[PDB]
Request: fold
Amino acid sequence: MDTKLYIDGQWVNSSSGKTVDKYSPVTGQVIGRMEAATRDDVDRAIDAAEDAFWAWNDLGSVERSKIIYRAKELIEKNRAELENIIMEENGKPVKEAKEEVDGVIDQIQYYAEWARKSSHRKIFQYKVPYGIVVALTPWNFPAGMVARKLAPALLTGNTVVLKPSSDTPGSAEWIVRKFVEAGVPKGVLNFITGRGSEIGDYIVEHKKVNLITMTGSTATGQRIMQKASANMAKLILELGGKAPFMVWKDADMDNALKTLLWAKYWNAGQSCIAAERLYVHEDIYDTFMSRFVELSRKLALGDPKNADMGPLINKGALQATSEIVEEAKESGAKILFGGSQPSLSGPYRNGYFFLPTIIGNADQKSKIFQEEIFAPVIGARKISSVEEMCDLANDNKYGLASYLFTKDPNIIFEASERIRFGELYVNMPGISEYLKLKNIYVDYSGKPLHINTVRDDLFQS
Amino acid sequence: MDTKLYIDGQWVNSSSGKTVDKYSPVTGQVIGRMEAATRDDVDRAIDAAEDAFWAWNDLGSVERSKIIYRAKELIEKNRAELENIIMEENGKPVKEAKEEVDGVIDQIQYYAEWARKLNGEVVEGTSSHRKIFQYKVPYGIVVALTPWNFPAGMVARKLAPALLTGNTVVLKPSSDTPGSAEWIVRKFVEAGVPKGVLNFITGRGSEIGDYIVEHKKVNLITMTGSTATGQRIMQKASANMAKLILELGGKAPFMVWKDADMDNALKTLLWAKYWNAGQSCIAAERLYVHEDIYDTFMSRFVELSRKLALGDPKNADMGPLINKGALQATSEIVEEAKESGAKILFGGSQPSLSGPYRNGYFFLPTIIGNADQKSKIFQEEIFAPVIGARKISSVEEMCDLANDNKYGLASYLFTKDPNIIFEASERIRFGELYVNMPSEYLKLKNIYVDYSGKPLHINTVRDDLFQS
Reply:
């Protein structure tokens, strides 16, 4: 499909006339185009948003919620199309796509459901929009993330300029279209595609932007933060991590294995909570590793209609992965399975597929263990004590997700405090952020004021 | 007084040996010294904090609260000393100092009172054999950057809650007001804060400030000060991804409609501009008065200003500016205002005071008319006892004037028309509107547990992989 821009209620082309090609990660062939927006286009979008803001605000939450509900309904009616788009653009297995769609739907529903939800001195506390919201959605879940971003912002009465990832405009565009159909007014939602190397910074630091909501890589987040010093925007940033996966000697093996499989290979490891480091107890280690290898052997790559795991999002990512693997190799590491592209028939051989890759002889200090991978590759390391394990877990710049398999309650308890991570998943696999409080303090006594530091003998005249 | 560093439980000197002189804003003479910490010192402090963190955490909230209470009590016992220090370092009128002290005490009390009240929570999972445990935990190592304008109160605001929530702290106060901060730190130590939990670093920000901000091991930065400084801090923290708590002042419009209670309004204005010589985040920075009363009001204001005494904290109504530099800046601003049309209706210079006080950094209450809405006086933060005034003749116009500003934190309105008040509640785009009157330190972490002890079924993991 060819995607366009949506600026002040119209589908338009880039003002410069430039486009960017969209490649299929399944075939490696161009399958679409998107418009490469200019600074000018961005500005226009922002202006539109500004214009629409007050009107949007005045409609009240209820009306907004109605619209949102309608949009959701529309999406539900045509979910198949969305699923197909997802399959095209990201190569996700069908099941995964379906799941994502479901999630999107549910989140929309949930966000809609928040609609309407001295003695002579009072404080009035209103909760009001921030104003103009810029939404940056990463292609990890190019629909789900959009849903997360757009809905609540919209409900709280903010106007929006959405820029999706250059890799996954299509889904986002579709969503936008759906929203428009549902009755979002002109200027309330604007859609801007384009290479971040040209416009991303500009979009971030623009004079009129009030809030930025973003999910993606840490570096990108950092950059955004740096930029926003110009306009003092409120920042909502989710920036992934390097989740340790810890399996103690007493773990239920099968379950653990399943969890590991999910954690690494769901969306080919391209997640903000994916298993990034494997730590297994020395007593079971070897056996466990084999089992894992065996499991990996059985996963099919290729067509979304039947594959267990999809491709990486683009050529560049694939290349990076390859480089990482090479680095691992050319520094001692044993590749226990995979470590290359698969060998597939027909169009699929030029897709960006990478084999499930498992690495031993793995240095705790190496790139494999210290830098985010975001791909179906993991290094494994033995452990022999709880404290040691904890130390290993904590030895990272990133602290988002973590996983633990054990039946020892004490250990679990201890990790609850010792593992310094935002989520710990044990034996298993926000709306207010978009509102600003304003206070109005009123004194209606009508009596003379007395202020400690102002002498009242100034007012016996 | 000569202040020092507190690093890993010891009072020490700077590693470089260098110090910075502290001037009295009342006399303009050097009255003390503080140590000019090095990068190395900062690093050491950070390390100490890191070391102490776990121990501090393990003590539990209750113990921490106890300590805090003790500290508060100690402060109360010796508040006079603190007051005196404040008077020395900032030249605040005695009353103001007292008020500040009171505030400090109260905030400490309040923060102590949250012990055991931010407990964790247990909520339902996605089945009857799944639970999600939500603990509230410290961020870790906190850097606290306190300003000079409320050099005790701000410290109190920063240190207490952080300490209670189980964070360890490296405090750097303003180079203009180390003494109060130091005293507070000492008090805390006396109360029983353990080694490394609280570290105190003084030093010129031009050397170390950036370094302190962007250090690898820092988890949270809490700061109050100027907007530019805040921006800089933000920029720096891209290096370490620290959680930021920033309070950055503003340019508060002061609006007086035709039906205002005159006297009260005047009093409020006086408070707003001249409290702490206008050196406050929510101080009156722009004056808008209704054309029907304007002239009279202005005179009245002028008259009031005439009556305010400057000089010694023991008897003055208003204190000096914090340093020579600030004074100079103020002077420059005034000159700019002059050399571009403006009528100085009163003041506009240093006062004429006897003895040592004439070399202090006092500036007269300054009131300016013929004031351009687009000028520096109306668009850039002043933070001094100077204000420009402008007529208004409609509500909409007034609103527009108010909103025409880069910085929007506080605002004041005097009127008896309810409709107007209502309208401003939505039309004035400011965080606080004063009408006819003058957990951040905790991180949530989740633990998801499945206890079923049964085989898991995950849509995308085929169970036919485990029929062998």
User: Anything to note?
Assistant: The CA atoms of residues 143 and 172 of chain A lie 6 Å apart. Chain A touches chain B through 62 residues (CB under 8 Å). DSSP finds 14 helices and 18 strands in chain A. The radius of gyration of chain A is 26 Å.
